[PDB]
Amino acid sequence: SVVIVGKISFCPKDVLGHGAEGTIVYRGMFDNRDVAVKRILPECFSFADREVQLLRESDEHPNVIRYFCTEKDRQFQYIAIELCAATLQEYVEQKDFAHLGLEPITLLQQTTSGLAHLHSLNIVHRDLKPHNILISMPNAHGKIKAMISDFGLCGTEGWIAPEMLENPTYTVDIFSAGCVFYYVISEGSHPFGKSLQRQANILLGACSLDCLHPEKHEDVIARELIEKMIAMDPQKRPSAKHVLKHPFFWSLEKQLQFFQDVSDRIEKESLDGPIVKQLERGGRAVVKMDWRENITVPLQTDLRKFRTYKGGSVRDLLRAMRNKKHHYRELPAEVRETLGSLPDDFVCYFTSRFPHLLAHTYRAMELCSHERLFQPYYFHE
Ligand SMILES: Cc1ccc(CNC(=O)N2CCC[C@]3(CCN(Cc4ccc(Cl)c(Cl)c4)C3)C2)cc1
């Protein structure tokens, strides 16, 4: 069977997905392209028109599903949208995409970038979940990407923010995004528990991130971001543009450059001042109360001669890293062997032995978020 309403045509017997206000998506064709075709019901006409026009009036974002064309009969609208290979649910559960080059963290960056593009248009998803996040068809070179969509393809409960249960703000989607982040990193777990118990745990705020290790650097960074996004108070949730600046997305090189930019910034500070007082507030726990005992012998031997370098100061640890990074070429051979392969192995050396160093430093240095030097690491204005 086939239905021809216009340049658009589709197959009623083939249903690709159902989201959001009685909308149903069928396989179809437009302009000799294979597309998915959404059927808009009269209740959704006003919502559709406003969003189509708003999307049409700005540039195309690679991480928002593409809009082709629309046709209208009396009883419905028909919108042709980009056809996709799979959902994020399949990507996480199936594991098939492991070798296709799209990594989990970069997938979340794309998902967040597309969500930020919608929020900049005053569009709120309100449905966001793994079923709604689609994996694109392969590129000419086989590259695939993640895309925001209102409909999923063929455990849907528990993705909704507590406050809704009407003009919601972006903060609703950030809560959903927070659950999606954990779902990808944990490979199928949800912060609020199993599918049937999620929505009740969301109202009383019972969440478990325990798939993230407390002493593992990578997991500590992710935990700090996720718990802010799924926070009960909507005002404590960061905007999508704030999320994109979190160290969760930084390359190893960018992490080491942050420590350097911080070290050069607090070099002249009063040490009674709020900056260093804030950074030293975490204190001994971050450095394990002596950071000279948590580093390997060749490094210990080299900086034992150096005066000062208080073992309980976070600033001094960052000062040592800054100095060994600067003199790296001129250091003794046995010292370069312990660090080596700069920046990657150099920064992993310290982050592996001090898993809270970057997270603690990032929260403490927010006081400089407005300053020009930290604009790569924070979002301001
Ligand atoms: C790619 C595209 C998107 C929307 C349209 C036109 N609208 C439309 O199809 N709708 C389907 C039914 C539900 C909604 C009401 C709220 N709306 C939120 C929302 C969620 C997700 C996205 Cl990506 C966007 Cl843009 C907006 C989705 C309207 C045409 C083409």
Domain segments of the chain as ranges: 1-82, 83-251, 252-381
Q: With helix as H, strand as E and coil as C, how does 179-224 read?
A: HHHHHHHCCCCCCCCCHHHHHHHHHHCCCCCCCCCCCCHHHHHHHH
Q: Where are the beta strands (DSSP E) in the chain?
A: 3-4, 8-19, 23-30, 33-40, 67-72, 77-81, 84-87, 133-136, 146-148
How many Cβ atoms from other residues are within 10 Å of residue 96's Cβ?
Answer: 11
Cis peptide before 343 (omega within 30 of 0): yes
Q: List CB contacts of 370: < 8 A, sequence separation 6 or more.
A: 380, 381
Q: List CB contacts of 353: < 8 A, sequence separation 6 or more.
A: 294, 295
Round to whole Å and give the CA distance between 286 and 282.
6
Long-range CB contacts (< 8 A, 24+ apart) of 361-369? 361/258, 361/259, 361/262, 361/279, 361/314, 361/318, 362/224, 362/247, 362/258, 363/224, 364/275, 364/278, 364/279, 364/281, 364/282, 365/262, 365/265, 365/275, 365/279, 367/274, 367/275, 367/278, 368/265, 368/275
Query: Do the beta carbons of residue 122 and residue 170 sit within 8 Å?
Result: no
Per 3-state DSSP, the chain is made up of helix, strand and coil in percentages (nearest 5) of: 45, 15, 40
Tokens of 196: 């049937």
Tokens of 296: 């390997």
How many Cβ atoms from other residues are within 10 Å of residue 121's Cβ?
Answer: 14
SS3 call for 36: strand
Question: What region does 125 belong to: left with phi over 0, alpha with psi -120 to 50, or beta?
Answer: alpha
Resolution in A: 2.5
Round to whole Å and give the CA distance between 146 and 112.
10
Tell the residue nearest (CA) to atom 8 of ligand 1: 48
Residue 71's φ and ψ, nearest 5 degrees, are -130, 145
Tokens of 226: 């996720």
Buried (b) or exposed (e) across 306-316, using 16+ Cβ within 10 A? eeebeebbbbb
Choose, from 34, 127, 233, 264, the residue flagged as catalytic. 127
- CA-to-CA separations, 255 to 33, 35, 250, 351, 362, in angstroms, rounded: 44, 42, 6, 9, 10
Q: What CATH number belongs to 1-82?
A: 3.30.200.20
- CA-to-CA separations, 81 to 24, 116, 117, in angstroms, rounded: 12, 20, 18
245 by Cβ neighbours in 10 Å (0-12 / 13-18 / 19+) ranks as buried
210 is catalytic: no
Q: What method did the depositors use to determine the structure? A: X-ray
Atom in ligand 1 nearest the alpha carbon of residue 65: 1
Tell the residue nearest (CA) to atom 13 of ligand 1: 20
Query: Do the beta carbons of residue 278 and residue 364 sit within 8 Å?
Result: yes
SS3 call for 289: coil
Q: Is 323 annotated as a binding residue?
A: no
CATH class of 252-381: mainly alpha
Amino acid at 82: E
Query: Do the beta carbons of residue 4 and residue 26 sit within 8 Å?
Result: no
Angle between helices 314-326 and 297-304 (to 10 degrees): 90
Whether the CB of 220 sits within 6 Å of ligand 1: no
Round to whole Å and give the CA distance between 256 and 306.
22
Round to whole Å and give the CA distance between 182 and 191.
7
Whether the CB of 21 sits within 6 Å of ligand 1: yes
Tokens of 15: 């249903």
Residue 269's φ and ψ, nearest 5 degrees, are -70, 160
Tokens 């708003």, located at residue: 54
Query: Do the beta carbons of residue 362 and residue 254 sit within 8 Å?
Result: no
Q: Is 18 annotated as a binding residue?
A: yes
Tell the residue nearest (CA) to atom 15 of ligand 1: 47
Round to whole Å and give the CA distance between 12 and 291.
66
Tokens 């590259």, located at residue: 143
Whether the CB of 52 sits within 6 Å of ligand 1: yes
Question: What region does 22 belong to: left with phi over 0, alpha with psi -120 to 50, or beta?
Answer: left
Tokens of 294: 């948590």
Question: What region does 20 belong to: left with phi over 0, alpha with psi -120 to 50, or beta?
Answer: left
Q: Which among 23, 51, 60, 76 is the best mutation to test ligand 1's pocket, defined by most ligand atoms within 8 Å of the CB?
A: 51
Tokens of 281: 């507030």
Round to whole Å and give the CA distance between 158 and 114.
22
Query: Do the beta carbons of residue 258 and residue 250 sit within 8 Å?
Result: yes
SS3 call for 23: strand
Round to whole Å and give the CA distance between 128 and 179.
10
Round to whole Å and give the CA distance between 138 and 64.
16
Q: Which among 150, 159, 160, 169 is the best mutation to test ligand 1's pocket, defined by most ligand atoms within 8 Å of the CB?
A: 150
Superfamily grouping for domain 83-251: Transferase(Phosphotransferase) domain 1 (1.10.510.10)
Round to whole Å and give the CA distance between 160 and 126.
8
Round to whole Å and give the CA distance between 27 and 16.
6
Q: Is 114 annotated as a binding residue?
A: no
Q: List CB contacts of 1: < 8 A, sequence separation 6 or more.
A: 11, 12, 13
Whether the CB of 81 sits within 6 Å of ligand 1: yes
Q: List CB contacts of 219: < 8 A, sequence separation 6 or more.
A: 212, 213
Instruction: Give distance in angstroms: CA of 142 to centre of ligand 1.
Output: 27
